[PDB]
From Swiss-Prot:
Disulphide bonds in the chain: C7-C161, C29-C33
PANTHER family on file: ERYTHROPOIETIN (PTHR10370:SF0)
Native organism: Homo sapiens (Human)
Gene of this entry: EPO
Domain of life: Eukaryota
Protein name, as recorded: Erythropoietin
Biological process terms in GO annotation: acute-phase response; blood circulation; cell surface receptor signaling pathway via STAT; cellular hyperosmotic response; embryo implantation; erythrocyte differentiation; erythrocyte maturation; erythropoietin-mediated signaling pathway
Length: 166
């Protein structure tokens, strides 16, 4: 059969591989990847404990708040340096790749078509939670994009698979 739903390590693993390459430059530049903004960033500190208080359906709604956050943070991230000056090599190139990943993610979660019942108003977190910390540097977004998926992605994937190899 195919590489399962999101239990396809090749896909998620690939997120880590990418954020890896991405991080190198946000931790190697000299001016870019470190502006003076103030964008919040999701807290990957979540755990199986506080995560369990979200049944399969709700669980999916939770990961959905996480990518929605990043959608905005990453959007401005592209914009500010595009519209403003921000010298140094074209950093935005990477902000397009990382962008496609969160996007495929959004469509992916909707792709298993399984328990998700992700139906809610236009909002989903972009108007209440935002219990995230501010960011005055890109080093955060990319590092976060490394830790973030290891958080909720692992959890969602656990449920995506919910069989392993029994």
């Amino acid at each position: 059969a195919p590489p399962r739903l999101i239990c396809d390590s090749r896909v998620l693993e690939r997120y880590l591989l990418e954020a890896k390459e991405a991080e190198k430059i946000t931790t190697g530049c000299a001016e870019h990847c470190s502006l003076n903004e103030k964008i919040t960033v999701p807290d990957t500190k979540v755990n199986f404990y506080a995560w369990k208080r979200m049944e399969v359906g709700q669980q999916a709604v939770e990961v959905w708040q996480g990518l929605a956050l990043l959608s905005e943070a990453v959007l401005r991230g592209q914009a500010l340096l595009v519209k403003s000056s921000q010298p140094w090599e074209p950093l935005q190139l990477h902000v397009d790749k990382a962008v496609s990943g969160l996007r495929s993610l959004t469509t992916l979660l909707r792709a298993l078509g399984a328990q998700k019942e992700a139906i809610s108003p236009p909002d989903a977190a972009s108007a209440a939670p935002l219990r995230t910390i501010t960011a005055d540097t890109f080093r955060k977004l990319f590092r976060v994009y490394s830790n973030f998926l290891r958080g909720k992605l692992k959890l969602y994937t656990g449920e995506a698979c919910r069989t392993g190899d029994r």
